[PDB]
Design an enzyme around this catalytic site. Structure first.
Site, short mmCIF file in Angstrom:
data_model
loop_
_atom_site.label_atom_id
_atom_site.label_comp_id
_atom_site.label_asym_id
_atom_site.label_seq_id
_atom_site.Cartn_x
_atom_site.Cartn_y
_atom_site.Cartn_z
N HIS A 163 0.82 -1.17 0.00
CA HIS A 163 0.00 0.00 0.00
C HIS A 163 0.87 1.23 0.00
CE1 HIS A 163 -0.26 1.17 4.35
NE2 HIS A 163 -0.08 -0.10 4.54
N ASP A 200 5.48 1.72 7.67
CA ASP A 200 4.16 1.51 7.10
C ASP A 200 3.72 2.54 6.13
OD1 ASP A 200 1.52 0.51 7.00
OD2 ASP A 200 0.99 1.41 8.93
N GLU A 210 -5.29 2.20 1.84
CA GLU A 210 -5.29 1.10 2.76
C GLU A 210 -5.66 1.54 4.18
OE1 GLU A 210 -3.40 0.26 5.43
OE2 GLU A 210 -4.18 -1.83 5.76
N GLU A 211 -5.19 2.76 4.57
CA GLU A 211 -5.37 3.23 5.94
C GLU A 211 -6.79 3.70 6.16
OE1 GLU A 211 -3.28 2.79 8.16
OE2 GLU A 211 -1.28 2.91 7.29
N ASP A 261 3.26 -5.59 3.75
CA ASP A 261 2.94 -4.49 4.62
C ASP A 261 3.89 -4.56 5.80
OD1 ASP A 261 1.95 -2.58 6.28
OD2 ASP A 261 -0.06 -3.44 6.49
N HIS A 298 2.07 4.93 12.29
CA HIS A 298 1.01 5.95 12.30
C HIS A 298 1.37 7.22 13.05
CE1 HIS A 298 -2.05 2.46 11.66
NE2 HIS A 298 -1.35 2.70 10.58
#
Ligand code: ZN
Ligand code: ZN
Ligand code: ZN
Ligand code: ZN
Lengths: 359, 360
Positions: B176, B189, B223-224, B251, B329
């Protein structure tokens, strides 16, 4: 600017949501919710903290009717290696020759058919041997009993270490029987029966107090269609004996190539996480390659457990394609087997018992 | 005495001893037979090699038997196997760690790669150019690229293909491209995965092999936001009847819980059991690091989108769920906390997966 989006959220996460949202549909495992796009990232942060799963954006697939229809499975976030010293010390106690002697005796029965006196004698002798072993090491928390097989005269043998422990048990099994006629049954399943007898001896000789009862079981009448294990599983249900995990040893001695020590983990009618755990125990404690195979419907006694949703796994001497060609014949003899291979399966049994029964 | 046996259809078809059918369904018959004939059926089952039988006599007659029925594993089906050692090992030797690090440098320099932002859009455009420039650089002529739209989200998914004309169930490798809003370098990520698969794509593009299957490299949008892009891609493939044999998702390919421990993790939730086991073998055979197993829950990553439509999909990852990177994140999800050897190992895994499965 901000839009409405619809998200499929596991109940465990959905219960903690505090941004504004409408519930569109719900079931035991999920809610579908409507929320603003500007609040979605808040839900990502929440999901990270809650650590029970994230969400799936279902806007594209849609509302309350569609949402309900869309809903007609969330995973919990174990089997680990945490007892290296105890396992490695117990593995050092396994005596290969003991396995060979047990197999010598089992294969000297003309057969071990569930319909025959020799079948019956086999069950009696296994029972005695376990009992003599418990006395020899002064193990005081053991118990044995037969589980009957209907019109079949051979009973299943159930043995337990930690008889009074009230927790889901760990079960280790093999089948004692053969077909009729002259059937030494060395590989199937003298070998497994003998491998688990030596593992029982090692647990019996320890002075550890486990957190769970440990059963060693030799099933009757496996060759007739898993008869004895179906009777045992039923016996456990009717006495409310809960079970955490089961391993089956059926064929532990034949190597396709004597120089290749690979052990096979069967992937059909078995529990996926428990199977993966066997692969790890093999790699961590046995130090041989692991490969995977399928053996089909009614393959062995693990299937009886798997059918009642009890986690069950099956490691085996070969793949299905390369199995011992002598099984189910008078040529199924001990000289064609490999003692190191049998020993490795015994090691696996011990490691499975100690790791899982100590948690 | 008689006994009742539950028999798979494949075996039931070959039975010639006397027997009564008590019940049947698509996968099974329950039959009644004399006990004296049971061993005959064992011998038969051994030879037919499609499964054995379960003795259901204890549980029973026709009503019980039909009720008992309310399946059968395949034993002579093709198996994921390792059969292309020389080609894989040569291709692994072509992977250039530095290219991974360079791609990651560029991806992490976008302020973020959010699917609702212009930077999200620029990311998709840059990945597409990069693949296309690479295809021209090596003279690979059987390639093709396209965007799949993401509804209200302005970032498209990037779908790429090597062997565009080949009419066979495809092999898909994904990652992603996106991040959250704010300042999100998104190194781990999923900059890391996006870069690892870019370098694997380069290796396939620079080979001269003609594979038996098309190979897709896909960078999903959004994706998020809950797997939005992957869902669009899956739907695109279903509506265009582009069949797919197997999918892997990358991922997070760069963070190591312990720099000295190179273990790679196979995720067991929302993934195909046989394909996941095959990844474990590919890791052990070609990468030579330990494998361990973990679950990451509903909506974990883009493999789930495929898994929901019963397309075989697998997810290897940099850590367990419990030991996952703590900077994910956040603005601290930076390149410097990552391990290039780990990212390279994942790139190798993608290369090995492509070459093994696309060559059969
Ligand atoms: Zn057997
Ligand atoms: Zn057998
Ligand atoms: Zn990610
Ligand atoms: Zn993520």
């Amino acid at each position: 600017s901000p839009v409405h989006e619809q998200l499929q959220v596991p109940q465990c996460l959905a219960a903690k949501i505090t941004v504004p949202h409408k519930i569109l549909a719900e079931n035991k495992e999920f809610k579908i919710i409507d929320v603003l796009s500007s609040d979605v990232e808040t839900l990502t942060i929440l999901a990270d903290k809650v650590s029970c799963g994230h969400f799936v954006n279902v806007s594209h697939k849609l509302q309350q009717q569609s949402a309900q229809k869309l809903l007609q499975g969330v995973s919990k976030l174990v089997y680990e290696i945490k007892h290296e010293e105890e396992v490695n010390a117990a593995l050092k106690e396994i005596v290969s020759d003991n396995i060979w002697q047990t197999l010598t005796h089992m294969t000297s029965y003309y057969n071990r058919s569930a319909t025959k006196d020799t079948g019956v004698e086999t069950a009696n002798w296994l029972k005695s041997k376990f009992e003599q072993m418990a006395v020899e090491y002064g193990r005081t928390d053991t118990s044995t009993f037969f589980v009957k097989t209907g019109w079949y005269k051979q009973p299943s043998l159930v043995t337990v270490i930690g008889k009074d422990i009230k927790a889901p048990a760990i079960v280790i099994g093999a089948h004692m029987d053969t077909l009729d006629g002259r059937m030494p049954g060395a590989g199937d399943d003298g070998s497994g029966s003998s491998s688990i007898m030596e593992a029982a001896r090692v647990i019996l000789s320890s002075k550890t107090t486990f957190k769970r009862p440990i059963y060693f079981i030799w099933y009757a009448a496996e060759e007739r269609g898993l008869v004895g294990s179906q009777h045992v599983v039923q016996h456990f249900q009717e006495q409310s004996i809960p079970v955490k995990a089961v391993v089956q040893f059926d064929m532990t001695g034949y190597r396709n190539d004597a120089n290749d020590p690979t052990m096979w983990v069967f992937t059909d009618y078995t529990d996926r996480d428990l199977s993966n755990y066997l692969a790890k125990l093999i790699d961590h404690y046995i130090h041989v390659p692991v490969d995977y195979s399928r053996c089909g419907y009614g393959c062995s006694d693990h299937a009886s457990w798997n059918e009642e949703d009890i986690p069950a796994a099956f490691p085996c001497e070969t793949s299905f394609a390369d199995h011992n060609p002598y099984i189910h014949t008078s040529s199924d003899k001990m000289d064609l087997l490999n003692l190191e291979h049998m020993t490795n399966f015994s090691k696996l049994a011990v490691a499975f018992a100690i790791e899982l029964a100590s948690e």
